[PDB]
Amino acid sequence: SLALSLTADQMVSALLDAEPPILYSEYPFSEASMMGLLTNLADRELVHMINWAKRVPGFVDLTLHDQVHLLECAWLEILMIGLVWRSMEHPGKLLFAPNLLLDRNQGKCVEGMVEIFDMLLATSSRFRMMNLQGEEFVCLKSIILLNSGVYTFKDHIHRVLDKITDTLIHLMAKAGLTLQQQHQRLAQLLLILSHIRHMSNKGMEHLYSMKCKNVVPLSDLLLEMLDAHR
Amino acid sequence: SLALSLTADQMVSALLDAEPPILYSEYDPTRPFSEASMMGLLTNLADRELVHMINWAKRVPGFVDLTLHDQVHLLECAWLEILMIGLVWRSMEHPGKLLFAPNLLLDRNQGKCVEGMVEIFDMLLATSSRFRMMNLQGEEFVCLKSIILLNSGVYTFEKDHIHRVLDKITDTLIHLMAKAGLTLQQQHQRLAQLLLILSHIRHMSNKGMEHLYSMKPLSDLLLEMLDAHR
Amino acid sequence: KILHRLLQD
Amino acid sequence: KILHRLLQD
Numbered sequence A: 001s002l003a004l005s006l007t008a009d010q011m012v013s014a015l016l017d018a019e020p021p022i023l024y025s026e027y028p029f030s031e032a033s034m035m036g037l038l039t040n041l042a043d044r045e046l047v048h049m050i051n052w053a054k055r056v057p058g059f060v061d062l063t064l065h066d067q068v069h070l071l072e073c074a075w076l077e078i079l080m081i082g083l084v085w086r087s088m089e090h091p092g093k094l095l096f097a098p099n100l101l102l103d104r105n106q107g108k109c110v111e112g113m114v115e116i117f118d119m120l121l122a123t124s125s126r127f128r129m130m131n132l133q134g135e136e137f138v139c140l141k142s143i144i145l146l147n148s149g150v151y152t153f154k155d156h157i158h159r160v161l162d163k164i165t166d167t168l169i170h171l172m173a174k175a176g177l178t179l180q181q182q183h184q185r186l187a188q189l190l191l192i193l194s195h196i197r198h199m200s201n202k203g204m205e206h207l208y209s210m211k212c213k214n215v216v217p218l219s220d221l222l223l224e225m226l227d228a229h230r
Numbered sequence B: 001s002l003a004l005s006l007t008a009d010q011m012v013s014a015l016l017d018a019e020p021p022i023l024y025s026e027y028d029p030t031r032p033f034s035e036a037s038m039m040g041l042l043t044n045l046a047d048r049e050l051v052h053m054i055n056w057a058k059r060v061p062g063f064v065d066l067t068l069h070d071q072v073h074l075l076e077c078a079w080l081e082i083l084m085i086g087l088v089w090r091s092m093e094h095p096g097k098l099l100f101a102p103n104l105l106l107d108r109n110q111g112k113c114v115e116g117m118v119e120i121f122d123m124l125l126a127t128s129s130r131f132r133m134m135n136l137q138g139e140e141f142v143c144l145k146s147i148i149l150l151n152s153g154v155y156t157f158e159k160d161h162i163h164r165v166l167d168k169i170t171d172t173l174i175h176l177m178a179k180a181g182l183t184l185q186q187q188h189q190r191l192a193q194l195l196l197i198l199s200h201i202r203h204m205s206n207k208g209m210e211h212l213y214s215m216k217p218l219s220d221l222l223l224e225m226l227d228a229h230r
Numbered sequence C, D: 001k002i003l004h005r006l007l008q009d
């Protein structure tokens, strides 16, 4: 490959440069209107995510089938960690878009959305409390892409995963963190990915339910991503 | 808290001594498998394991210092995760097989008797193959299982004390790897690999849970643990 | 709650 | 699938 040859700084720069843009919403809400805005936004973000994925070091070296599997498994995790990251500087609120800032009360517009809204808010507070840096964020999101579906198939993938781990440690060591503080922070960050997975699973459970399929006509692409999780 | 003063060695010894026993199944090998019977075996086994898990949690350093409501929450959230990682650990020396009990060894073909279970069976087997590939040690296993207990429900409602204990188990893991002759880079890499598996265990629990409380003779305890996820 | 009771034991 | 098309473009 060519991802393993890159240095720890070349890895960060490649990930920061590959960062997808922050899209805007469609300029009070009901259940239909709320789901409509989120669906429309998520559908447009997916297009940028796919192109972001190809710019992730070592992802183009993967076969087409494996690229599909990884994206199908982690797409909601990636959307959610992006949402959580954007909402870091907005405590108690979720920044879906610069023109779409919502709180937990607006999460009551859709039946069963509040519980997941709270989990997302809790993740954002955790990122804020840890003072998560953008350099660390792009590493975590790339890890999600490569790891979430790696055990549903790969030595190359785990090699890149180790490379991002080396990248994460290098970032903390270049921040003045002691050896103990480094692997402690590394652990704290990766444990949050377990919660991101949980939020995705609970979220996915409602989204591909018949009652949520019918509330608003979803795009064919978004349906294919949803139907991948049955 | 006595947990925050334990050395890495005392942490391991405490976790190893707190290990629950390996229970047996009822399973009469003279009769073929049906969907109702095999589900009955797994349900009956899990119910008796739950009792041992509850008393195991009390012996996990730092868990007794938590409030009862928080103890209930952590166990309700992670009970299937803990059951599954225990299963995966028992099945590590049995490729293609899942050792639910010493007298209950099943392959993916025997998992087809229950509709929708073979999907979870393959994920569990893949996780077992991963542990076998990484050559997971018992000292590492008990650390990971304790992490699941303390981490899985910590972001759904103190927390500062829990993260402090989590940091100690992290120190414990690093201490074990350094003792195994692993370099500093190897320690951080292996630490990452182990914690990333917890994301998959969370996934298996969620997908497993989703099937279990769906259209499925469960015990009252197992029902309450299942109804915790609605 | 059974879990809460068994934890009390 | 559409994902195939978006990945090859």
Ligand SMILES: COc1ccc([C@H]2CCCC(=C(c3ccc(O)cc3)c3ccc(O)cc3)C2)cc1
Pocket: A038, A039, A041, A042, A045, A076, A079, A080, A082, A083, A096, A110, A111, A112, A113, A116, A117, A202, A203, A206, A207, A212, A222
């Ligand atoms: C019925 O219960 C519900 C209702 C809504 C959700 C949401 C709420 C959190 C954000 C989520 C979504 C989301 C996440 C990130 C983002 O940038 C843009 C969008 C989402 C995903 C797919 C979709 O078709 C619609 C929205 C999913 C979860 C459960």
Ligand SMILES: COc1ccc([C@H]2CCCC(=C(c3ccc(O)cc3)c3ccc(O)cc3)C2)cc1
Pocket: B042, B043, B045, B046, B049, B080, B083, B084, B086, B087, B100, B114, B115, B116, B117, B120, B121, B207, B208, B211, B212, B218, B222
């Ligand atoms: C309908 O789809 C299904 C059906 C069954 C499952 C299982 C199979 C893998 C092992 C699992 C179970 C399990 C896990 C660990 C263990 O030591 C002992 C038992 C289990 C948990 C609760 C329960 O009420 C029954 C079984 C869960 C998963 C999906």
